[PDB]
Write a protein that holds these residues in place. Sequence first.
Motif, mmCIF file in Angstrom:
data_model
loop_
_atom_site.group_PDB
_atom_site.id
_atom_site.type_symbol
_atom_site.label_atom_id
_atom_site.label_comp_id
_atom_site.label_asym_id
_atom_site.label_seq_id
_atom_site.Cartn_x
_atom_site.Cartn_y
_atom_site.Cartn_z
ATOM 1 N N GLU A 172 6.262 5.020 -4.677
ATOM 2 C CA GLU A 172 5.247 4.805 -3.655
ATOM 3 C C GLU A 172 5.676 5.314 -2.289
ATOM 4 O O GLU A 172 4.845 5.817 -1.530
ATOM 5 C CB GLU A 172 4.905 3.320 -3.549
ATOM 6 C CG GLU A 172 4.267 2.715 -4.787
ATOM 7 C CD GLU A 172 5.286 2.229 -5.801
ATOM 8 O OE1 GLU A 172 6.498 2.412 -5.563
ATOM 9 O OE2 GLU A 172 4.874 1.657 -6.835
ATOM 10 N N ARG A 227 2.423 -2.183 -4.771
ATOM 11 C CA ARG A 227 1.736 -1.152 -4.010
ATOM 12 C C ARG A 227 0.865 -0.302 -4.916
ATOM 13 O O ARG A 227 1.369 0.479 -5.728
ATOM 14 C CB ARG A 227 2.747 -0.314 -3.254
ATOM 15 C CG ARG A 227 3.390 -1.152 -2.217
ATOM 16 C CD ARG A 227 4.379 -0.412 -1.415
ATOM 17 N NE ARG A 227 4.969 -1.333 -0.472
ATOM 18 C CZ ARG A 227 5.974 -1.023 0.317
ATOM 19 N NH1 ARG A 227 6.489 0.190 0.265
ATOM 20 N NH2 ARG A 227 6.459 -1.924 1.153
ATOM 21 N N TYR A 274 0.842 -1.186 0.000
ATOM 22 C CA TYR A 274 0.000 0.000 0.000
ATOM 23 C C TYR A 274 0.875 1.233 0.000
ATOM 24 O O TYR A 274 2.061 1.159 0.319
ATOM 25 C CB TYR A 274 -0.957 0.043 1.183
ATOM 26 C CG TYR A 274 -0.294 -0.093 2.506
ATOM 27 C CD1 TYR A 274 0.279 0.986 3.129
ATOM 28 C CD2 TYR A 274 -0.309 -1.295 3.169
ATOM 29 C CE1 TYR A 274 0.873 0.857 4.351
ATOM 30 C CE2 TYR A 274 0.270 -1.433 4.392
ATOM 31 C CZ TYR A 274 0.863 -0.357 4.979
ATOM 32 O OH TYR A 274 1.451 -0.498 6.207
ATOM 33 N N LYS A 312 7.727 7.703 -1.391
ATOM 34 C CA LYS A 312 8.223 9.070 -1.277
ATOM 35 C C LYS A 312 7.731 9.755 -0.022
ATOM 36 O O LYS A 312 8.387 10.668 0.483
ATOM 37 C CB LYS A 312 7.792 9.907 -2.469
ATOM 38 C CG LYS A 312 8.494 9.602 -3.739
ATOM 39 C CD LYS A 312 8.109 10.630 -4.767
ATOM 40 C CE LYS A 312 6.637 10.501 -5.106
ATOM 41 N NZ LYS A 312 6.240 11.422 -6.204
ATOM 42 N N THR A 313 6.569 9.355 0.481
ATOM 43 C CA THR A 313 6.044 9.973 1.685
ATOM 44 C C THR A 313 6.971 9.739 2.862
ATOM 45 O O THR A 313 7.492 10.681 3.464
ATOM 46 C CB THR A 313 4.677 9.395 1.997
ATOM 47 O OG1 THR A 313 4.830 8.002 2.273
ATOM 48 C CG2 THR A 313 3.778 9.547 0.799
ATOM 49 N N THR A 314 7.207 8.481 3.187
ATOM 50 C CA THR A 314 7.800 8.136 4.465
ATOM 51 C C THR A 314 9.319 8.031 4.414
ATOM 52 O O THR A 314 9.959 7.969 5.465
ATOM 53 C CB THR A 314 7.178 6.825 4.945
ATOM 54 O OG1 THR A 314 5.758 6.980 4.965
ATOM 55 C CG2 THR A 314 7.598 6.501 6.353
ATOM 56 N N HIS A 353 1.023 5.114 1.522
ATOM 57 C CA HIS A 353 0.418 6.076 2.421
ATOM 58 C C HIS A 353 -0.124 7.262 1.656
ATOM 59 O O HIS A 353 0.541 7.811 0.776
ATOM 60 C CB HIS A 353 1.424 6.522 3.461
ATOM 61 C CG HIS A 353 1.801 5.438 4.405
ATOM 62 N ND1 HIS A 353 0.934 4.971 5.366
ATOM 63 C CD2 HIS A 353 2.924 4.696 4.517
ATOM 64 C CE1 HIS A 353 1.517 4.006 6.048
ATOM 65 N NE2 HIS A 353 2.725 3.817 5.552
ATOM 66 N N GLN A 400 9.488 2.527 5.362
ATOM 67 C CA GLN A 400 8.870 1.463 4.593
ATOM 68 C C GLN A 400 9.958 0.570 4.042
ATOM 69 O O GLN A 400 10.963 1.062 3.529
ATOM 70 C CB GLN A 400 8.057 2.021 3.431
ATOM 71 C CG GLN A 400 6.790 2.722 3.812
ATOM 72 C CD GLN A 400 5.800 1.775 4.426
ATOM 73 O OE1 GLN A 400 5.634 0.652 3.961
ATOM 74 N NE2 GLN A 400 5.149 2.210 5.487
#
Lengths: 209, 521, 521
Positions: free
Chosen positions: B350, B515, B210, B352-354, B212, B393
């Motif tokens: 995918e 993801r 997944y 890049k957020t965390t 985020h 992640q």
Amino acid sequence: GADGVGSSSGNWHCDSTWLGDRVITTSTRTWALPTYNNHLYKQISNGTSGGSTNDNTYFGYSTPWGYFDFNRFHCHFSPRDWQRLINNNWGFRPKRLNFKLFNIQVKEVTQNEGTKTIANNLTSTIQVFTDSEYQLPYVLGSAHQGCLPPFPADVFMIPQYGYLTLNNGSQAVGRSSFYCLEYFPSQMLRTGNNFEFSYQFEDVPFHSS
Amino acid sequence: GADGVGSSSGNWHCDSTWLGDRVITTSTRTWALPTYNNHLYKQISNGTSGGSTNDNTYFGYSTPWGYFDFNRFHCHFSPRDWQRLINNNWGFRPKRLNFKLFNIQVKEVTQNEGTKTIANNLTSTIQVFTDSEYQLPYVLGSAHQGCLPPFPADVFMIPQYGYLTLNNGSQAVGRSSFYCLEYFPSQMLRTGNNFEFSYQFEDVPFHSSYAHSQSLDRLMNPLIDQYLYYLSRTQSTGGTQGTQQLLFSQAGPANMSAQAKNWLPGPCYRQQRVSTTLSQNNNSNFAWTGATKYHLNGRDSLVNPGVAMATHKDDEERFFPSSGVLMFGKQGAGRDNVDYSSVMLTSEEEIKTTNPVATEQYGVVADNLQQTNTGPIVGNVNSQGALPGMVWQNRDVYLQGPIWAKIPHTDGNFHPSPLMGGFGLKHPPPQILIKNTPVPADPPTTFSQAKLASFITQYSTGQVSVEIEWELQKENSKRWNPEIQYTSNYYKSTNVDFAVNTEGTYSEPRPIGTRYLTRNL
Amino acid sequence: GADGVGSSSGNWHCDSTWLGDRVITTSTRTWALPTYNNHLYKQISNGTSGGSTNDNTYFGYSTPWGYFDFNRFHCHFSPRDWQRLINNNWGFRPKRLNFKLFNIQVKEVTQNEGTKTIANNLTSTIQVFTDSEYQLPYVLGSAHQGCLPPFPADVFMIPQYGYLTLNNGSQAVGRSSFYCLEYFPSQMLRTGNNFEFSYQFEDVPFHSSYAHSQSLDRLMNPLIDQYLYYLSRTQSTGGTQGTQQLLFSQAGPANMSAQAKNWLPGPCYRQQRVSTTLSQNNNSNFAWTGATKYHLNGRDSLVNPGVAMATHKDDEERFFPSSGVLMFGKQGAGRDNVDYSSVMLTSEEEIKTTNPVATEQYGVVADNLQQTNTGPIVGNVNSQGALPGMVWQNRDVYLQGPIWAKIPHTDGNFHPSPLMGGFGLKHPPPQILIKNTPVPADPPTTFSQAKLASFITQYSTGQVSVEIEWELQKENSKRWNPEIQYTSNYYKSTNVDFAVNTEGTYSEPRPIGTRYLTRNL
């Protein structure tokens, strides 16, 4: 098991029993299955870019697999027994059929100069499965050749299995479906083994004669 | 027994059953095992005395044995059945697998002039054993070739088994270990027999599939301010004189950057950046020279891929880290110095957020200590270790990627999980080893002290079947709008993807990330 | 039911019971919920096309819903009852909380010329639901305003609910998630009804309140030497010639610095140092420029506060790290660019033992590799990750600070615990959401396709009650002399602290640290 190589796995039944109204008709033939597509799947097509016109465009695959076709009457009725049927009766419909392979023997062959020589291969196997979930294109019913030959002495060649799918011209669209037949549960057979299953026809109207 | 030669010892199961959450996937392939090393063990090495440099020195043996490698996903999932997995599910982990050999037939071959002729040898046997005590070097997990071919019609060659051990240069040290595989209990098989065993995966965390939906810095509430204060301005503003003054403020919607945040980005180990556009990259070879390496025992080893890090930031597609990403080939791609077009490039977008962007600095810290006379100076942190308050992640898994790896048994490890992705395991599936039982040719009449140097050229073939019971974490989410899903092209194409071509060569056009579905961080 | 309008649906409990170790603390306040967004969802954003820079870009929605925030301590502890806690106890953690709405009365209002007139609306309802499946962005934990006011006489306004999501610049990407809150099961309430639910905190470590009495380097025995040796001197001493020689010694009482120690200070991420005395700081604005930042997805985000680190070393009170400390306001302090006098500054002095000073280097390591001709050169480590053998202290909690935060659900995290302090949780208390049920005005007679754009101006008010059962770790210690205790001033003052002033404005003079009692490291 209690079969082995020294023993035959079946008998020969070609007979027609008339029992009251029910009429049981059986048949048996000798089949020979050549290797197909050097064990390859192949995309095949015909484009209109050649001599073909836009009506003849197709897209499809030709698998190495092959399939028994009994679909024609003259497989299941000897002309006399087909006479008793149409003289004395208004209508008939099937009920259940049964199917058997047996006495399977596998062979290999080598080419040495001009000598063409055959031998037996005991361990080699063949794969058999029926689609009972109808998950494959069902290609019977278009009346292709290769059905069990009418006259039981004949020995016939199992026809190759292929199918057609959506196209636009010669190319394919996103809904074009592919199938790898080795992806289904199948049974592997050794010269001792046999294969059998029983089918039951769904309720169907008497064919009017 | 009740098997014998006349009967087949198994069936053919290639199927995928979706049962509730559990998903059972099985496969079967045809294998052929060539004789290896004329039945010899061999010390092999590469010394730096040749063209090799000190990094490439190795020492090790190549045994005659060979081993089944199923480790890659595309063995166990047909792309459709791999679509149902990544569209409808958050996470999945294996539970137990089962393994079968059967229909083993052995063959021998002779060379008489130019005639190349094969026959059957009924009595000859093959040896099979699994290491359930993990007493051997476990060589799966390095993503070597030879895994069960994706498309079940293919017939594959079992790869040879060898291993590497300590060296100093080309020579060996006292701790150099040797192993004779015939020294383990093994089972000998005859064309009638089959071999089967059942494994059970140890407790393992669900692999997260997944992305985020909330970048880690955006956890705030857009509307409401905060009650904390930060230092906005060090200097009295709006006057001719620069007199320094401490003013404070609150970080609201206007300035979200200064808000107090409860967590940190994941750890960062920098990579060099490379553009697919040729003109943009420098003119040199920086590939190996400017590479990101780690130094061990005098041998500099390139970091491939490295820690999981976002491939490229927003609104730049083209830039990718030097080693940072897994790179596969296209079907039929050359082995060496092949052009860019043939390789495929996985992407980390995918996460890049965390996690920080791979090719860019992690952060900035103060270099000096300010004074009246000293202007503050701040440096870059290129590599930042793990600090309390970091979430991250792990690396995504791909249809082609490896499924697991064996955690080395050592006293201390930090968050085991492979760099290639997949699952770390402290007791991986055992590795199956198999060899043709050597058959000597006719020895002389008079006794001879020497061991027998002749053998009957031989190979064996059979069928192998493996199933894996998987557990799924159902996706339960309230998101109103549609998700993103992996879907085949709608538009026409020369020929179907993930399917055979004219000449019969199966081909997979692009890697498949795991993801798509989204989850609230 | 047996409630109706004529009867009140609850009572007023504000109390604190000390039962053995368990301590039950409850509170109640009066709340008023204004209609939000004329009952609309709104996409909100800030683009960098305006004065905003690329760091401040956001994308998100502002819902009409609103949410109770009790997250701060001073909601749940009266300063006295917060004194008994920190004087007599080492550690405390919550166990279960309970929550109640009651005595809900709804009102409407009309504007007729300048007459502003209110009335009661009996039938109108409000909607209430908690997310127990955590299916929403959890926006508590960022320390936004609007928590239950400390002094129970106050009556507060429930803050609006909104959230932020992925962006690229001001626009949105495909993974941008939307949520319509009316899409969850919720309960509709009538002035007779009440709402109640019970929560249970997951297993969580006792929050440590205490200050180690032994600095980490002093664990030794003063009297006795050690049997280990260290390198004291590289050069033969007391001769005209500098001939190098290796001499060794033992580290005894005389030199304690060279002793072999079994542990390390906690991790360190540097901050810039600032003096309260204006003349000492530089003349410039280094606030944002020389700030300690981390770079994420092209957006540079200031680190507030950062990892827990000792504020200032011994015999310097005045210096404090740039962002390193939590900073509150004094009562009635301005929102923006307010002077130093109005803010309050928390201090980390308690942890100076086990953690490095914030504004100073963590350590020194060798830059180069020495030789006959090469003098050794050693560099500074400004930021040092976690290494084996490190112990540290999490950040202290304050009476004003946040109680908990929601650990993001991700595959890998290192020692979760918020930077603001408090408890990390993987299943925090659900957040309660509440909204006035919209009441449309009179629609036209002839049917109209459009949705109804008019509503009756409305607001609702009621009472809310929350209790938290806490567990204490009793303080059992043999220290002979008295401890340090938090105590109010003995000397006279203009007016009582933590109590109302002339005009009725409650005020809390200074933050309250949780660490007084001492413990042997």
